[PDB]
Symmetry: D2
Subunit: 141 residues, 4 copies
């Protein structure tokens, strides 16, 4: 499917007022923004910053998004966000992501995303590049 491990990639974020709602907790929709930011940072770390992606005519598009909410985060909490690849298809990828509170590791949100790889110009489906497929478990190319 797609294998994960090692020093498992986590991106760290701070919760600001913009992220919160009237309840005094993170607005539930905003966890998907945090998860999106983490996928961008995982790509960067594997050698696929935004200039590299547009260089190779690659664009990633969300076709489906699912989130399950468990415990709340408050103003000024820090969040750790994973970006695992659960399955790797020819022209798409499924991400499995966890948002945890940094102080105590309690799971706040779990998300699953089906993400399509397309031509940046024309938005038509394309195969995930070789080097990218490789990166998703270890990248010296």
């Amino acid at each position: 499917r797609a294998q994960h491990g090692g020093k498992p990639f986590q991106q760290r974020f701070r919760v600001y007022y913009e992220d919160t709602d009237a309840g005094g907790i993170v607005y539930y929709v905003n966890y998907l923004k945090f998860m999106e930011r983490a996928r961008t940072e995982r790509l960067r770390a594997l050698g696929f910053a935004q200039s590299q992606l547009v260089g190779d005519n690659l664009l990633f598009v969300v076709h489906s998004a699912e989130a399950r909410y468990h415990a709340p985060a408050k103003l000024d909490d820090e969040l750790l966000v994973s970006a695992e690849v659960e399955e790797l298809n020819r022209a798409s990828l499924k991400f499995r992501q966890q948002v945890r509170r940094a102080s105590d590791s309690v799971l706040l949100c779990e998300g699953r995303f089906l993400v399509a790889c397309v031509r940046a110009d024309t938005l038509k489906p394309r195969a995930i590049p070789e080097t990218l497929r490789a990166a998703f478990a270890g990248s010296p190319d």
Copy 2:
């Protein structure tokens, strides 16, 4: 059945020239609030009865794009009513031609507004759907 109409503004759009995919969940949320209002459950009623609704799960499937200044029609069907929760089924369609843009499914929990603990949905509310 019930549909709520919304306008797409600059704030909703992304570098692609289309609605940012996350934002469809906001539009669907607005429609649920408006469905509740129309069945007699505005915000003042909810805080009156010590009710708060919290999303426990959210799923969206994306089909076709919407652009700046499009109008959207958004449904808010209640597929199930459980003791302490409700499950919604929603569609976002472009107003001009009815093309399906997004579909969403949500499990929404009812909790005490004071203590945030799970509580039963009130009788009157359960009836308002039924």
Copy 3:
């Protein structure tokens, strides 16, 4: 400068959870979004919907924004938002806007915006069109 009156244009909006913060009130930044939506709706009503603007190669760009905050709005309040033109220059316009609570008319926010008119293609400064300048106090063209 630029003259206002009549049945003074107001756009009506509802406050949803997305608009609120941890304080239980509208997040202050969001009033600028409401004011922007009102300017778009005022333009629409004067004959300048988005398809008309791109038709005439017009784009409006904010060069400055000032807001003063007075009283708070809560979840599920309705807002009335004005979009007055305070001054009309050759290639730009200054808007003066008020956000009021619908129930009791109390002033929540006042904003001022310097807005530039530019070519939609190339983003270069252009004159505000004749018909648009006219619309800002009465439009049979």
Copy 4:
């Protein structure tokens, strides 16, 4: 002096391919929180002392655009400290070449966290700037 560094993501961008102008105020807000943290005033300290900071006025002047994946440097200078309020002066610059993107000015009021009424800035806080 103090600068906070931020990344521009898709969520920040608009149909123009640049940061949505409203979003610079969010970035400036984050920088004020981070300046306060570094001088010993995290959120837990503020709620500990019954303090809340509220924006009473906000001004932004826009100069040049930032794009997807740019890094931003954001300053958070305190120009004045009054009895019950503070006035900030902020600059947003592109990290790569230091070009000025936005400048902002904010009057921020100190209020009681319980009752929302105006209160004096604590001595310790006034000192931390001075």
